[PDB]
Structure 1
Amino acid sequence: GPSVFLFPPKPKDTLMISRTPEVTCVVVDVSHEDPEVKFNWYVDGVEVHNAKTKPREEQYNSTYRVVSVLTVLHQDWLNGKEYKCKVSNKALPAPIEKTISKAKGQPREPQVYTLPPSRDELTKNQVSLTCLVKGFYPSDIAVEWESNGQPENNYKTTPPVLDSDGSFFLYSKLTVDKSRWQQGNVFSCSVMHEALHNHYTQKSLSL
């Protein structure tokens, strides 16, 4: 029979008020003999009817996949409200309820430290600009780089690593042409996190 997977909003969407966070209920292995699926959405046990449900899309494995999308209020997600998708279908003798919420825990403010390339790396044509982000909790975070206000996306960020004090840390590595660094261009690490003031901080880095 069908199975259901419930997905949280992207952290950046929940932290920046202009963006649009969504909880997504995904139903897979919907059969052709019983293809009708009903969604019921609940926020802290209270039914809500503003979800937008997409039409069944057939998969290459001859099963249907039907998706319902619930737009959420930033502050509801951040305050730990619970989001329940209930999925009814004639092949389910009982519906499937999945419930999700923001990761729990006392929030801790990330400290953001930018680190220039090592001297040893200056023999290479590209150098590594490092953004250390430590002391944060919970682990939901967004880390981006830019220069002159424009995205610098040739970077890679480690997963959050649990540190010895219960907090998380990560590193972000931006790779740039050495000529850009030694000519004094300014790069900046931007970090978004619920424990930050206005959910946003930016640290710069230059020669």
Structure 2
Amino acid sequence: VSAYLSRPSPFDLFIRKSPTITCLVVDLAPSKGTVQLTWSRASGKPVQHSTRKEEKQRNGTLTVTSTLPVGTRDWIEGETYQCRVTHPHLPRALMRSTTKTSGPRAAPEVYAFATPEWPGSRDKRTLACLIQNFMPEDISVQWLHNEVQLPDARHSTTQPRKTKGSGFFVFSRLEVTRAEWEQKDEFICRAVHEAASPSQTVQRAVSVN
């Protein structure tokens, strides 16, 4: 049995301003309807109501996820949140905690590129975005077309990796359609990161032609 606790996404924390964290306990093969999941704050102040979601996955094991909304100011000023997991056949209850990452800050460089045409793909292009030299590693990426955000399912972002320096990079990939670039040939890759000043966004336009 293993447990994971995430931090809020920069997007939710800075753009939507409704940050949440998620406690994920995995690999709970056997059943005894009572995998207790308890939230609290390191300061002792009260936590909000959380949602619960337990799903049998077809690898023989059970997954349970609980999401807790947190205060925007509370998280930025450095509160630490904690998820204690009590299982029925537990030896000891398992504790996980989360807080904003410490260390130096550094704004991401953003660069946006369009691929050329490949044989057998006249009506689509791939756009890629390189976002690099940021710290800490938490970052969201959003793509915009017609001054609106495209659904997130439409792009994929790689996991943060260390650069040869002390900063991190991710790449983001987004396939687009002729209908889109012809209607408006400008796509914006926008990084959301706390060190980006002000407004926590740095962004870059690219066009297909």
* TM-score calculated relative to the size of structure 1: 0.74
CA distance change for structure 1 residues 35 and 166 in 2, over 3 Å: closer, same or farther?
same
Name the SS for the 1:92 alignment partner.
Answer: coil
CA distance change for structure 1 residues 90 and 173 in 2, over 3 Å: closer, same or farther?
closer
Q: Counterpart of 1:11 in structure 2: which amino acid? A: P
Check whether the contact 2:107–2:133 (CA below 8 A) recurs between aligned residues: yes
Q: CA deviation at 1:129?
A: 3.5
Check whether the contact 1:41–1:47 (CA below 8 A) recurs between aligned residues: no
Structure 2 segments unaligned to the other structure (5+ residues): none
Query: Which residue of 17, 37, 46 corresponds with 2:44?
Result: 46
User: Which residue is equivalent to 1:26?
Assistant: 25
Distance 1:55 1:179 in 2: 39
Q: CA deviation at 1:72?
A: 1.0
Name the SS for the 2:199 alignment partner.
Answer: helix
Q: Counterpart of 1:201 in structure 2: which amino acid? A: V
- Once the two structures are superposed, residues 19-67 of structure 1 have per-residue CA deviations (whole angstroms, 9 ceiling, x without a partner) of 34233253652854x5334443222252634232537656667766544
User: Which residue is equivalent to 1:136?
Assistant: 134
Distance 1:163 1:122 in 2: 30
Structure 1 segments unaligned to the other structure (5+ residues): none
Name the SS for the 1:77 alignment partner.
Answer: helix
User: Which residue is equivalent to 1:171?
Assistant: 171
Name the SS for the 1:75 alignment partner.
Answer: helix
User: Which residue is equivalent to 1:204?
Assistant: 205
Alpha-carbon RMSD across the aligned residues, in angstroms, is 3.5
- Once the two structures are superposed, residues 128-147 of structure 1 have per-residue CA deviations (whole angstroms, 9 ceiling, x without a partner) of 43433222111111122222
* TM-score calculated relative to the size of structure 2: 0.73
- Once the two structures are superposed, residues 84-131 of structure 1 have per-residue CA deviations (whole angstroms, 9 ceiling, x without a partner) of 1122344224322122233332111112233455xxx35752444343
Check whether the contact 1:28–1:66 (CA below 8 A) recurs between aligned residues: no
Distance 2:186 2:110 in 1: 16
Q: Counterpart of 1:189 in structure 2: which amino acid? A: C
Name the SS for the 2:102 alignment partner.
Answer: coil
Name the SS for the 1:54 alignment partner.
Answer: strand
Which of these two proteins has the greater Rg computed from alpha carbons? 1
User: Which residue is equivalent to 2:9?
Assistant: 10
Name the SS for the 2:28 alignment partner.
Answer: strand
Identity in percent: 29
Q: Counterpart of 1:188 in structure 2: which amino acid? A: I
CA distance change for structure 1 residues 160 and 52 in 2, over 3 Å: closer, same or farther?
closer
CA distance change for structure 1 residues 31 and 190 in 2, over 3 Å: closer, same or farther?
same
User: Which residue is equivalent to 1:112?
Assistant: 110
